[PDB]
């Protein structure tokens, strides 16, 4: 710790040097500042090798410490000759952090895959490089490999392909609505576009007709309730089957008319807990509203022992209506 | 005329021409005769249906703005006249408009400026532009003497 | 033989009892003009109807249908009016100021000044864009998104037989939505609406309007591969393909 920080304390002079000297000069001492550090790499890996398992910790520890000094080392090279850099690269034999991002300075797309092809596991480490970060474009290419799936695949023409990743990257969908709905429209116009036999065809635009279905219903939610819920336009989830059947009978929702219900007795088939519970819950505010005609109307829309009765009073025209409700059923 | 003369004429073409598109496309000569009829929440609403089906109208667009000037919105009678603008640039009397409009209601926004300026170009130093030059400024003795 | 007949067009106007053929007659000749993208054509005869034919003229399938259709047909148009002003604009970006290396002291005061105005002008032709981008959308929305039952799609369905009119109403569709959406998608792109750009695959695929039917497989891929170029500029920004924030 006195015999390392004298050679950090001579890179950072030899590099104010370099700054005003004779090019043939500044070089060798360039070589000399990659001899001397290529030594302290060394010491810093042989001791590493030297403990390992149990008290891991402290060994997780020093490692942060000699990796944020090979990019202390590499900042300071990224100056200097790159030329070296192929030997830094190689002396703490990894540290691709630096030597990537030089093949990226220059168009040497040649050395980037003169990396790869010598390497364990670069690969999976460029692409997440570049990830974290024209021939770049090349790079998209294979970097689009992942969810960006379907970019590549309607460039590669490959539309058949383009539209299961779109259709699966609607469905995990659930931070954004406005997201999932742009997505299917994708995937659906990927499909219609593709090269499907017609049969084929056929049922991905039905099994397709089921989702907007869904969709459809959190589409349809009254401008009242959602300034009165003070609630973002697009920016909202995907909301599913009960929030939705909850938030249709709201008494926010105050203009609830029958179609508002009818839709909140279809989202019963989009649950996957207490079933007949709701069923109650919605049919009774389904008779607040009515202020004893729309009880009236769903009866009429539904075309029957799903409703319940006795458990329902849990008077005089609720009896009276399912009399007229025994002879339409029959 | 009177209120039986029009809404019994609803019958009249009703009888005629029954599906939705041409029922609404209706509107603009059903508001026709209810603006004439003083019925102007009413023929609000068949203007207002007509541009739900013929969205494209220069015509329609300004009646329904002219039909929020007498209903003193000027949020929306100017947008009214905007949209007739946009379709239409031949319709110089409602450039003068917006900008008069606009100077009139709030000048904070730069929008109220932008629609003076070609309000100038279109009628060249009329008695108007002056109005509205001052118009614009008096939302200070020295300011307007200059 | 287009004289022959837009003129046939005036004597139909002239007695007002004919107003309802003036105007049917009127479509049928406009429904030429547009498969032929003639708008100046399509348009002169537009002007030759009196502004208040449709007020007058109130109702047979064949009126219905064609008060329609003269609408329809009139957001066709505007769609193009206003496009190609929009279009025309675009197109004379103020230009940046002339660089003269190894400046006199007066000239470098010159162009101190030249370099200052033109950092105003360029800030009024984003100013006009955006009142033009703003105005040239609105109508191609109302083409696409056609009121009540889709563009140049008759609304009243109780007619006489007219295989030359309703096939020439599937085939304007087929020719002029494809190219309304493929000039929207290049007005978002050109004004850096990317995330828009993407909302056109919801537009079209839509089963409210069903616009994809009126797509030939080529032309939806070509669409596919607009909206990747959207994309990519969305990416450089640094958010996810469809322009939502990358948490």
């Given at each position: 710790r006195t015999v390392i920080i004298r050679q950090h304390e001579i890179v950072l002079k030899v590099a104010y040097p370099q700054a005003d000297s004779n090019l043939r000069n500044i070089v060798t001492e360039q070589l000399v500042a990659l001899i001397d550090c290529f030594l302290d790499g060394y010491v810093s890996q042989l001791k590493s090798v030297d403990k390992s398992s149990n008290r891991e910790r402290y060994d997780n520890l020093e490692m942060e410490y000699l990796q944020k000094r090979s990019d202390l080392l590499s900042p300071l090279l990224s100056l200097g000759q790159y030329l070296w850099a192929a030997s830094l690269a190689e002396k703490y034999c990894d540290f691709d952090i630096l030597v990537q991002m030089c093949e990226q300075t220059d168009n040497q797309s040649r050395l980037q895959?003169?990396?790869?092809?010598?390497?364990?596991?670069?690969?999976?480490?460029?692409?997440?490089?570049?990830?974290?970060?024209?021939?770049?474009?090349?790079?998209?290419?294979?970097?689009?490999?992942?969810?960006?799936?379907?970019?590549?695949?309607?460039?590669?023409?490959?539309?058949?392909?383009?539209?299961?990743?779109?259709?699966?990257?609607?469905?995990?969908?659930?931070?954004?609505?406005?997201?999932?709905?742009?997505?299917?429209?994708?995937?659906?116009?990927?499909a219609l576009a593709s090269d499907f036999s017609e049969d084929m065809l056929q049922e991905k635009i039905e099994e397709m007709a089921e989702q907007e279905r869904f969709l459809l219903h959190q589409e349809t939610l009254p401008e009242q309730l959602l300034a009165e819920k003070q609630l973002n336009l697009s920016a909202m989830p995907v909301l599913t089957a009960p929030q939705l059947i909850g938030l249709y009978i709201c008494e926010e929702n105050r203009r609830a008319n029958e179609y508002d219900f009818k839709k909140a007795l279809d989202l019963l088939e989009y649950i996957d807990i207490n079933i007949n519970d709701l069923k109650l819950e919605i049919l009774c505010k389904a008779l607040q509203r009515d202020n004893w005609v729309s009880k009236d109307s769903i009866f009429v829309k539904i075309l029957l022992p799903e409703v319940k009765d006795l458990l329902q009073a849990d008077e005089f025209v609720l009896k009276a209506n399912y009399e007229y409700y025994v002879q339409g059923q029959i | 005329?009177?209120?039986?003369?029009?809404?019994?004429?609803?019958?009249?073409?009703?009888?005629?021409?029954?599906?939705?598109?041409?029922?609404?496309?209706?509107?603009?000569?059903?508001?026709?005769?209810?603006?004439?009829?003083?019925?102007?929440?009413?023929?609000?609403?068949?203007?207002?249906?007509?541009?739900?089906?013929?969205?494209?109208?220069?015509?329609?667009?300004?009646?329904?703005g002219l039909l929020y000037e007498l209903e003193e919105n000027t949020d929306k009678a100017v947008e009214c006249y905007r949209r007739s603008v946009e379709l239409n640039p031949t319709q110089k009397d409602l450039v003068l408009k917006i900008a008069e409009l606009l100077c009139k209601n709030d000048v904070t926004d730069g929008r109220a400026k932008y629609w003076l300026e070609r309000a100038a170009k279109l009628f060249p130093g009329s008695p108007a532009i002056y109005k509205l030059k001052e118009q614009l400024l008096d939302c200070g003795w020295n300011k307007l003497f200059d | 033989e287009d004289r022959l007949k837009i003129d046939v067009i005036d004597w139909l106007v002239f007695d007002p009892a004919q107003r309802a053929e003036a105007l049917k007659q009127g479509n049928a000749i406009m429904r030429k003009f547009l498969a032929s993208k003639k708008h100046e054509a399509a348009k002169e005869v537009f002007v030759k109807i009196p502004q208040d034919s449709i007020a007058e003229i109130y109702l047979p399938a064949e009126d219905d249908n064609a008060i329609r259709e003269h609408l329809c047909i009139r957001a066709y148009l505007e769609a193009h009016e206003?496009?190609?002003?929009?279009?025309?604009?675009?197109?004379?970006?103020?230009?940046?100021?002339?660089?003269?290396?190894?400046?006199?002291?007066?000239?470098?005061?010159?162009?101190?000044?030249?370099?200052?105005?033109?950092?105003?002008?360029?800030?009024?032709?984003?100013?006009?864009?955006?009142?033009?981008?703003?105005?040239?959308?609105?109508?191609?929305y109302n083409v696409l998104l056609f009121v009540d039952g889709g563009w140049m799609v008759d609304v009243r369905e109780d007619a006489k037989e007219d295989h030359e009119r309703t096939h020439q109403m599937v085939l304007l569709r087929k020719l002029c939505l494809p190219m309304l959406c493929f000039l929207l998608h290049t007005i978002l792109h050109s004004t850096g609406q990317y995330q828009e750009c993407l909302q056109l695959a919801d537009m079209v695929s839509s089963e409210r309007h069903k616009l994809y039917l009126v797509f030939s497989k080529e032309e939806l891929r070509?669409?596919?591969?607009?909206?990747?170029?959207?994309?990519?500029?969305?990416?450089?920004?640094?958010?996810?393909?469809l322009g939502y924030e990358i948490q």
């Amino acid at each position: 710790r006195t015999v390392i920080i004298r050679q950090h304390e001579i890179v950072l002079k030899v590099a104010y040097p370099q700054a005003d000297s004779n090019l043939r000069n500044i070089v060798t001492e360039q070589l000399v500042a990659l001899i001397d550090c290529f030594l302290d790499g060394y010491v810093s890996q042989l001791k590493s090798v030297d403990k390992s398992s149990n008290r891991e910790r402290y060994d997780n520890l020093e490692m942060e410490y000699l990796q944020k000094r090979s990019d202390l080392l590499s900042p300071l090279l990224s100056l200097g000759q790159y030329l070296w850099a192929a030997s830094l690269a190689e002396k703490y034999c990894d540290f691709d952090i630096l030597v990537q991002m030089c093949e990226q300075t220059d168009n040497q797309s040649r050395l980037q895959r003169y990396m790869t092809q010598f390497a364990d596991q670069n690969f999976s480490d460029f692409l997440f490089r570049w990830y974290l970060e024209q021939h770049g474009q090349l790079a998209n290419f294979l970097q689009a490999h992942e969810h960006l799936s379907w970019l590549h695949e309607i460039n590669s023409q490959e539309l058949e392909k383009a539209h299961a990743t779109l259709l699966g990257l609607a469905n995990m969908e659930t931070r954004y609505f406005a997201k999932k709905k742009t997505l299917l429209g994708l995937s659906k116009l990927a499909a219609l576009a593709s090269d499907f036999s017609e049969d084929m065809l056929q049922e991905k635009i039905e099994e397709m007709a089921e989702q907007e279905r869904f969709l459809l219903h959190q589409e349809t939610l009254p401008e009242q309730l959602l300034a009165e819920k003070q609630l973002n336009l697009s920016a909202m989830p995907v909301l599913t089957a009960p929030q939705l059947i909850g938030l249709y009978i709201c008494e926010e929702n105050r203009r609830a008319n029958e179609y508002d219900f009818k839709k909140a007795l279809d989202l019963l088939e989009y649950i996957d807990i207490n079933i007949n519970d709701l069923k109650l819950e919605i049919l009774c505010k389904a008779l607040q509203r009515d202020n004893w005609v729309s009880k009236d109307s769903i009866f009429v829309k539904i075309l029957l022992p799903e409703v319940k009765d006795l458990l329902q009073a849990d008077e005089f025209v609720l009896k009276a209506n399912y009399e007229y409700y025994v002879q339409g059923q029959i | 005329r009177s209120k039986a003369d029009v809404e019994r004429y609803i019958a009249s073409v009703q009888g005629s021409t029954p599906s939705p598109r041409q029922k609404s496309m209706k509107g603009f000569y059903f508001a026709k005769l209810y603006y004439e009829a003083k019925e102007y929440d009413l023929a609000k609403k068949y203007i207002c249906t007509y541009i739900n089906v013929q969205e494209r109208d220069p015509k329609a667009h300004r009646f329904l703005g002219l039909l929020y000037e007498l209903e003193e919105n000027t949020d929306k009678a100017v947008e009214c006249y905007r949209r007739s603008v946009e379709l239409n640039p031949t319709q110089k009397d409602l450039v003068l408009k917006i900008a008069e409009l606009l100077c009139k209601n709030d000048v904070t926004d730069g929008r109220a400026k932008y629609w003076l300026e070609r309000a100038a170009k279109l009628f060249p130093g009329s008695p108007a532009i002056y109005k509205l030059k001052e118009q614009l400024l008096d939302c200070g003795w020295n300011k307007l003497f200059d | 033989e287009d004289r022959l007949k837009i003129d046939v067009i005036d004597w139909l106007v002239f007695d007002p009892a004919q107003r309802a053929e003036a105007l049917k007659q009127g479509n049928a000749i406009m429904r030429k003009f547009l498969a032929s993208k003639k708008h100046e054509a399509a348009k002169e005869v537009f002007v030759k109807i009196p502004q208040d034919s449709i007020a007058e003229i109130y109702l047979p399938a064949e009126d219905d249908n064609a008060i329609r259709e003269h609408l329809c047909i009139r957001a066709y148009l505007e769609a193009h009016e206003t496009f190609n002003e929009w279009f025309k604009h675009m197109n004379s970006v103020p230009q940046k100021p002339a660089l003269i290396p190894q400046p006199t002291f007066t000239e470098k005061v010159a162009h101190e000044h030249k370099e200052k105005k033109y950092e105003m002008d360029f800030g009024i032709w984003k100013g006009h864009l955006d009142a033009l981008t703003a105005d040239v959308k609105e109508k191609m929305y109302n083409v696409l998104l056609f009121v009540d039952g889709g563009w140049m799609v008759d609304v009243r369905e109780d007619a006489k037989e007219d295989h030359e009119r309703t096939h020439q109403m599937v085939l304007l569709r087929k020719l002029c939505l494809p190219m309304l959406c493929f000039l929207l998608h290049t007005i978002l792109h050109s004004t850096g609406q990317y995330q828009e750009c993407l909302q056109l695959a919801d537009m079209v695929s839509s089963e409210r309007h069903k616009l994809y039917l009126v797509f030939s497989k080529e032309e939806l891929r070509k669409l596919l591969q607009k909206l990747r170029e959207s994309s990519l500029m969305l990416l450089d920004q640094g958010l996810d393909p469809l322009g939502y924030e990358i948490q």
